[PDB]
Amino acid sequence: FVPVELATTIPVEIQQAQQEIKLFNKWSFEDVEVKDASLVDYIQISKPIYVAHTAGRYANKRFRKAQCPIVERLTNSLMMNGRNNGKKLKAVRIVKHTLEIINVLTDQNPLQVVVDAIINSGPREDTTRVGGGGAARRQAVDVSPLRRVNQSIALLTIGAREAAFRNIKTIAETLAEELINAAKGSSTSYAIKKKDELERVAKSNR
């Protein structure tokens, strides 16, 4: 759509309405459906980042961490454990692969699926070692939104990590699968299970 005439060679896709609509590396950053009420500026969406790799300041204020794209945050979380500290390019690649897998399996815009997974993993009721003398007493504490989101993301990544530790399954595919499980259908994913267990524990305590 509308080829721009240059002396330098530019691909057809770039020429097409990607100049017009600025959504992702060829994915929909629209749709915009958060299942829980509001939750925006805690799960970012909105800002149509092209590739989940932005170098900015997201530790230098209290809540500014929220303005990280969710995909980017996922990538960052993936970037973990010795063999992979730094190497964000790899993480980005893995995320792309995951997205592709999601697209292939049960269709849909993968971003929405990711969002769903984030929503449906994370816990409402949590436990803190309050003490009561330092002993095994844990009062049930409800979780703040941003923190909860972060926790969910971490557990998702953890699931993938667990899956990959000596297996044929490349990280990305496994991650995608677990994300899908988390979203809705089976709920036999690791992260979601863990979250549910935590919630149960919180319920049985005060």
Binding site: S187, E197, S204
Partner: protein, 148 residues
């Protein structure tokens, strides 16, 4: 792969007495394997592990070892076990131990056959242990009866 549950039905019941072999300690308690019901993962939340404050965790519970336990919360949909060690009454403990032993014996019986001939394990379980259980309660009792 070798699997399949100890009893007749797939999922554990509320207030079922179990014996738990300790795998690893995390935050809630331990992700233990229930040796009275399949190998489904569950946890003892840090409040119901012992009757009194005993400070030490790796002497009264111990990683690798078995603990006399009871199932508190069960969710018949996917797979969660909220478990207790404290709610097991005095005595009762002996009974639980006996049950565990029986279960172990039953398990021992059902593997030799498999080894001798492969073939699906579920089918084997169906044709050896379950009908008797349904008739009475436990497979070891049935075995005892047979012996008699």
């Amino acid at each position: 792969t070798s699997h399949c549950r100890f009893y007749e039905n797939k999922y554990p019941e509320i207030d079922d007495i179990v014996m738990v072999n300790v795998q690893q300690i995390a935050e809630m308690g331990a992700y233990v394997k229930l040796l009275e019901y399949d190998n489904i993962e569950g946890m003892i939340l840090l409040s119901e592990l012992s009757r009194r404050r005993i400070r030490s965790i790796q002497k009264l519970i111990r990683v690798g070892k078995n603990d006399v336990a009871v199932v508190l919360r069960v969710d018949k949909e996917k797979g969660y076990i909220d478990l207790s060690k404290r709610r097991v009454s005095s005595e009762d403990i002996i009974k639980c131990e006996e049950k565990y032993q029986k279960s172990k014996t039953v398990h021992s019986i059902l593997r030799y056959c498999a080894e001798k001939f492969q073939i699906p394990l579920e089918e084997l379980y169906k044709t050896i242990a379950w009908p008797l259980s349904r008739k009475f309660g436990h497979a070891y009792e049935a075995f005892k009866l047979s012996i008699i």
